[PDB]
């Protein structure tokens, strides 16, 4: 039963014949160093031994990236920041953001930016941090978190994390496999999600990356929200099933007496994101920005949106991250009638994070804040000081704060008696508990050579390729006089436009003319082609946005922000009276804080999204004409190319529905011979299905509209379009198949 032990600074101590690590270096087996004691008794013994700064340092989590020594020429070295974070801020949680991949020959360690690190180099970096954490007085280990890594970027061998379709494609593939085996498409064949999660957990754990910022349980019920690209589905029951499988596969199925799925077999502890559900954004605008503070619920579906989180809580998820949106007129769950959650950001609401999440939904783990939101994105708290903002989060129930690297911030709060020592301790118990249950006090190191053998292994990449082929959804397969168009015929001339690699397409045995020409040069005609292959999407370009510019945010010609958030002080929040200019909600204009010349929080729309006055343009014709949207390749070119072939049924459209884009009848895109929704796949996965080596089997995990009107006109918290006039062009569950 002796758990494997690894110490590279502290000494191994024996007692009762068994072995242990002396992380305190007292020479005695302190109870917290005893792996046989129950974990609540271990933490009780360790928190009793820590100073307030040490316990306050657990409430911080910040970026700690691998570094490169420009003279040593070695990658995977501790950066400067590590010593400060570990020994002075007493931090034990970090975000790992380096890309893991094999650098090309000629890559020199330019001391600038986050270097690309190989799997073995990441593992050595993570081990180094763990060793510094072992050198700490109480040698508490560290935990790294990361955003998702196993997904194809649809706008871009061993060594990198294995590549799967985007989250929505995982849902599409799961639905399609249930449909193939039972003819139905509702809650999905979670065997595909467990197969995905099994690759990720293996590769993540092998580099010492035992935590995640994710996955996202948010529902794609509002199509104008730019974050729909990171959601699995619009259907809460499918998402809840996905969240349950993710937790059971990435964390164990072994739940402790405290209800948390945490064992030494936990490969990745999850921090579910955007509780209680950031999907229903008003006008699709996102809370990262002052104009988009509001989350509205016209169909009364607030309970449906936290349903996925419930199933993950019930499965034993380790951590929860609250969003920064303001619930507007949401009936408090388990409360007297007429009561509405305070018009304050969830990240600051004691009633959501302690009441809804902990008391009503039963959550026993710890709560982890989001980044870049506590100091300058405290909605409902624009009048407050920055320390008051921080105390509202912590007393509201948030235990660790993301993007904070100065422990003096917490102790200044405790000194100013804004936060209690009892709180700093309750936080410490919740934050220390997973480090014990996951076995990190016994062995927090990983073997770097095994990382080379694991990250991107041949079988792992085969599973991702499998899911890519199964994630494609055939939306339209016109039947010619000759027969179906998509099972492509062997041989023929083929015109390509968009992100097709010409040689991989030639390699299937086709003569290919390449429509993708530089801007200046001339583009060959598509006349004569037997098939036209177009891979198309749309992106934002909002980087010019300035809130205080009279041309932009203060431009009356751009209309007014129709969103109204009435504060509990009874006066509207600045700029959110329903009658202000789009840039009026930003602090640099309202200036309702304790800083004289506050900087704008929305300028450049750094995080994504369109110009707010354009966030309802999701049809391709409109996007082509909009200022902050771009169709790629331009819809003008697509339409020329579709004219040059005298039959539009020779056009195959591969569309990446980053949001639920509208194939309007004006665009002509619905006259193509075939239309497919892709969520990220290699060119050979795509050509495999189009050529009939594999048949398409995936189903849409969110409905698609056919009218600009249905987009404006659907309920932000409701899935589908059935409540709209024009309705859904394609519903959830829709999937054609080669017959
Ligand atoms: Zn000891
Ligand atoms: Zn100190
Ligand atoms: Zn294993
Ligand atoms: Zn279930
Ligand atoms: Zn976030
Ligand atoms: Zn005091
Ligand atoms: Zn080894
Ligand atoms: Zn081993
Ligand atoms: Zn493997
Ligand atoms: Zn040829
Ligand atoms: Zn032209
Ligand atoms: Zn035709
Ligand atoms: Zn909706």
- The CA 239 to ligand 6 mean position distance, Å, reads 46
- The CA 289 to ligand 5 mean position distance, Å, reads 13
CA–CA distance, 262 with 252 (Å, rounded to integer) = 6
| Number of CB atoms found within 10 A of residue 277's CB | 29
List the beta bridge partners of residue 350: none
Ligand (nearest to CA of 377): 5
Kindly list the distances between the CA atom of residue 343 and the CA atoms of 349, 433, 577, 606, 643, in Å, as whole numbers in the listed order: 9, 33, 14, 25, 53
DSSP one-letter code for 207: T
* Percentage helix, strand, coil for the chain under 3-state DSSP, each rounded to 5: 35, 15, 50
CA–CA distance, 435 with 679 (Å, rounded to integer) = 35
Ligand (nearest to CA of 702): 13
Q: Which domains does the chain have, with CATH numbers?
A: 11-142+446-454 (no CATH), 190-221+234-437 (3.20.20.300), 473-542+614-678+703-730 (3.40.50), 556-612 (no CATH)
Say if CB 732 and CB 701 are below 8 A apart: yes
- The CA 187 to ligand 4 mean position distance, Å, reads 10
- The CA 4 to ligand 8 mean position distance, Å, reads 8
CA–CA distance, 345 with 692 (Å, rounded to integer) = 50
φ, ψ at 136 (rounded to 5°): -65, 150
Q: Which two tokens stand for residue 54?
A: 């040490």
CA–CA distance, 128 with 208 (Å, rounded to integer) = 10
Please choose, from the candidates 244, 342, 225, the residue with its C-alpha nearest in 3D space to the C-alpha of residue 292: 225
Q: In what order do the strands lie in the sheet with 93-95?
A: 143-145, 93-95, 60-63, 401-402
- The CA 430 to ligand 3 mean position distance, Å, reads 27
Kindly list the distances between the CA atom of residue 340 and the CA atoms of 334, 401, 445, 666, in Å, as whole numbers in the listed order: 11, 26, 48, 43
φ, ψ at 675 (rounded to 5°): -135, 135
Give burial (CB, 10 Å; 0-12/13-18/19+) of 132.
middle
For 665-691, give one letter per residue: b (16+ CB within 10 A) or e. Answer: eebbbbbbbbbbbbbbbbbbbbbbbbb
Give burial (CB, 10 Å; 0-12/13-18/19+) of 713.
middle
- Strands annotated E in 659-706: 674-678, 704-705
Kindly list the distances between the CA atom of residue 57 and the CA atoms of 50, 86, 200, 298, in Å, as whole numbers in the listed order: 11, 9, 29, 41
CA–CA distance, 725 with 739 (Å, rounded to integer) = 33
- The CA 355 to ligand 4 mean position distance, Å, reads 24
Say if CB 297 and CB 591 are below 8 A apart: no
- The CA 631 to ligand 11 mean position distance, Å, reads 15
- The CA 448 to ligand 7 mean position distance, Å, reads 7
For the chain, breaks with the C atom over 2.5 A from the next N come after: 156
- The CA 8 to ligand 2 mean position distance, Å, reads 22
Length in residues, the chain: 739
Say if CB 642 and CB 532 are below 8 A apart: yes
- The CA 480 to ligand 11 mean position distance, Å, reads 29
- The CA 10 to ligand 1 mean position distance, Å, reads 10
CA–CA distance, 134 with 337 (Å, rounded to integer) = 53
DSSP SS3 for 483:
coil
CA–CA distance, 381 with 567 (Å, rounded to integer) = 10
Residue 308: alpha-carbon gap to chain centroid: 15
Residue 575: alpha-carbon gap to chain centroid: 29
- The CA 88 to ligand 2 mean position distance, Å, reads 5
Q: Quick one: CA dihedral 122, 126, 131, 132, positive or negative?
A: positive
Contacts of 96 (CB under 8 A, 6+ apart): 64, 65, 66, 122, 126, 144, 145, 146, 209
- The CA 639 to ligand 11 mean position distance, Å, reads 9
| Number of CB atoms found within 10 A of residue 417's CB | 8
Say if CB 234 and CB 221 are below 8 A apart: yes
Please choose, from the candidates 111, 145, 126, 123, the residue with its C-alpha nearest in 3D space to the C-alpha of residue 269: 145
CA–CA distance, 61 with 405 (Å, rounded to integer) = 7
Ligand (nearest to CA of 272): 5
What stretch of H or E contains 654?
A: strand 651-656
Ligand (nearest to CA of 49): 1
| Resolution in angstrom units | 2.0
Ligand (nearest to CA of 52): 2
Say if CB 648 and CB 627 are below 8 A apart: no
- The CA 526 to ligand 10 mean position distance, Å, reads 17
Whether the ω angle into residue 276 lies within 30 degrees of 0, i.e. cis, is: yes
CA–CA distance, 496 with 485 (Å, rounded to integer) = 16
CA–CA distance, 159 with 146 (Å, rounded to integer) = 17
Q: Which two tokens stand for residue 382?
A: 């624009």
Ligand (nearest to CA of 645): 12
Ligand (nearest to CA of 418): 6
Say if CB 324 and CB 379 are below 8 A apart: yes
Residue found under tokens 């503070």: 293
- The CA 737 to ligand 4 mean position distance, Å, reads 28
Say if CB 242 and CB 188 are below 8 A apart: yes
Angle at 633 between CA 631 and CA 637, to 5 degrees: 105
Q: Half-sphere exposure (CA, 13 Å, Cβ side) for 176?
A: 25
What protein residues have CB closer than 5 angstroms to ion ligand 13?
A: 221, 714-715, 718
Residue found under tokens 């360790």: 46
The method of structure determination was X-ray
Say if CB 31 and CB 41 are below 8 A apart: yes
- The CA 501 to ligand 10 mean position distance, Å, reads 15
Q: Give residue 372's region: left, alpha or beta (phi > 0; psi -120 to 50).
A: left
Residue found under tokens 């895109």: 669
Ligand (nearest to CA of 441): 1
- The CA 12 to ligand 1 mean position distance, Å, reads 10
Residue found under tokens 């002080």: 569
- The CA 306 to ligand 4 mean position distance, Å, reads 15
Angle at 210 between CA 449 and CA 214, to 5 degrees: 130
- The CA 101 to ligand 9 mean position distance, Å, reads 17
Q: Quick one: CA dihedral 245, 249, 250, 256, positive or negative?
A: positive
- Strands annotated E in 53-103: 60-63, 67-69, 74-77, 93-95
Please choose, from the candidates 364, 272, 293, the residue with its C-alpha nearest in 3D space to the C-alpha of residue 566: 293
Calculate Rg over the CA atoms of the chain: 27
- The CA 530 to ligand 10 mean position distance, Å, reads 14
Strand-strand pairing, 704-705 and 651-656: unpaired
Contacts of 500 (CB under 8 A, 6+ apart): 516, 533, 535, 683
Ligand (nearest to CA of 264): 3
| Number of CB atoms found within 10 A of residue 733's CB | 18
Say if CB 160 and CB 101 are below 8 A apart: yes
List the beta bridge partners of residue 273: 216, 321
- The CA 273 to ligand 5 mean position distance, Å, reads 7
Say if CB 431 and CB 25 are below 8 A apart: no
Ligand (nearest to CA of 5): 8
Contacts of 180 (CB under 8 A, 6+ apart): 697
DSSP one-letter code for 546: -
Please choose, from the candidates 694, 672, 685, 697, the residue with its C-alpha nearest in 3D space to the C-alpha of residue 473: 697
- The CA 557 to ligand 13 mean position distance, Å, reads 28
DSSP SS3 for 345:
coil
What protein residues have CB closer than 5 angstroms to ion ligand 5?
A: 370
CA–CA distance, 320 with 97 (Å, rounded to integer) = 20
CA–CA distance, 213 with 229 (Å, rounded to integer) = 16
- The CA 466 to ligand 13 mean position distance, Å, reads 31
């Amino acid at each position: 039963e002796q758990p494997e032990l690894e110490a590279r600074v502290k000494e191994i101590i024996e007692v009762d014949g068994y072995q242990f690590r002396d992380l305190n270096d007292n020479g005695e087996l302190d109870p917290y160093e005893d792996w046989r004691l129950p974990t609540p008794e271990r933490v009780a013994d360790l928190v009793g031994q820590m100073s307030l700064v040490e316990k306050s340092g657990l409430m911080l989590i910040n970026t700690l990236n691998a570094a490169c020594d420009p003279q040593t020429g070695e990658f995977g070295v501790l950066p400067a920041q590590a010593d400060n974070y570990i020994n002075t801020q007493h931090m034990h949680r970090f975000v790992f953001r380096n890309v893991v991949d094999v650098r090309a020959e000629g890559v020199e360690c330019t001391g600038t930016g986050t270097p690309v690190v190989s799997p073995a180099e990441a593992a050595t970096f993570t081990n180094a941090v763990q060793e510094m954490s072992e050198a700490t007085r109480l040698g508490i280990p560290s935990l790294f978190k990361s955003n998702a890594r196993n997904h194809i970027d649809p706008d871009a061998a061993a060594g990198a994390f294995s590549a799967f379709p985007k989250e929505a494609g995982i849902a599409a593939a799961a639905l399609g496999e249930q449909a193939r085996r039972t003819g139905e498409a509702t809650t999905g064949d979670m065997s595909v999600v467990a197969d995905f999660a099994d690759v990720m957990g293996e590769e993540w754990a092998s580099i010492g990356l035992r935590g995640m910022y994710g996955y996202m349980a948010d529902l794609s019920t509002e199509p104008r929200w730019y974050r729909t690209h990171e959601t699995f589905t619009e259907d809460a029951y499918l998402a809840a099933e996905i969240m349950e499988t993710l937790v059971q596969t990435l964390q164990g199925e072994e739940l402790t007496d405290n209800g948390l799925a945490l064992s030494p077999q936990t490969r990745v502890a999850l921090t579910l994101k955007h509780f209680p559900g950031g999907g229903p954004q008003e006008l699709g605008l996102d809370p990262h920005y002052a104009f988009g503070k509001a989350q509205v619920y016209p169909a009364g579906r607030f309970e449906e949106h936290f349903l996925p989180f419930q199933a993950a809580i019930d499965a034993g998820v380790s951590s929860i991250m609250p969003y920064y949106g303001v619930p507007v007129d949401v009936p408090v769950v388990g409360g007297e009638p007429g009561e509405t959650y305070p018009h304050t950001g969830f990240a600051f609401s004691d009633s959501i994070v302690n009441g809804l999440l902990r008391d009503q939904l039963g959550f026993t783990g710890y709560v982890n804040s989001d980044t870049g939101i506590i100091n300058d994105r405290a909605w409902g708290l624009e009048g407050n000081t920055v320390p008051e903002r921080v105390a509202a989060a912590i007393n509201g129930g948030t235990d660790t704060l993301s993007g904070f690297s100065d422990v003096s911030v917490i102790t200044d709060l405790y000194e100013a008696d804004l936060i209690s020592e009892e709180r700093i301790d309750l936080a410490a118990e919740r934050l220390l508990e997973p480090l014990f249950d996951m076995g990190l006090f016994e062995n927090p190191y990983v073997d770097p050579d095994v990382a080379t053998a694991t990250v991107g292994a041949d079988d792992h990449r085969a599973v991702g390729l499998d899911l890519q082929r199964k994630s494609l959804v055939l939306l339209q397969n016109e039947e010619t006089d000759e027969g179906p168009v998509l099972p492509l015929k062997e041989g023929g001339d083929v015109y390509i436009l968009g992100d097709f690699t010409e040689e991989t397409v030639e390699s299937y045995g086709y003569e290919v003319t390449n429509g993708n020409v530089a801007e200046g040069e001339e583009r060959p005609s598509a006349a004569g082609s037997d098939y036209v292959l177009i891979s198309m999407t749309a992106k934002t370009n909002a980087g010019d946005y300035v809130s205080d510019d009279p041309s932009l945010g203060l431009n009356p010609d751009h209309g007014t922000n129709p969103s109204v958030i009435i504060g509990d002080d009874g006066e509207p929040l600045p700029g959110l009276d329903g009658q202000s200019l789009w840039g009026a909600a930003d602090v640099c204009v309202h200036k309702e804080g304790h800083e004289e010349n506050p900087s704008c929080t929305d300028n450049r729309l750094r995080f994504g999204g369109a110009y707010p006055w354009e966030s309802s343009i999701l049809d391709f014709t409109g996007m082509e004409a909009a200022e902050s949207w771009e169709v790629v390749p331009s819809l003008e070119t697509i339409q020329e190319v579709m004219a040059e072939v005298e039959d539009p049924s020779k056009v195959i459209l591969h569309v990446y529905f980053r949001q639920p884009y509208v194939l309007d009848e004006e665009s002509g895109l619905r006259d193509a011979g075939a239309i497919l929704a892709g969520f990220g796949m290699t060119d050979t996965a795509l050509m495999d299905v189009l050529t009939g080596a594999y048949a398409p089997q995936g189903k849409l995990p969110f409905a698609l509209a056919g009218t600009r009107e249905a987009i404006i006109e659907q309920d932000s918290d409701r899935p589908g379009y059935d409540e709209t006039e024009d309705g859904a062009l394609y519903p959830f569950g829709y999937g054609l198949t080669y017959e």
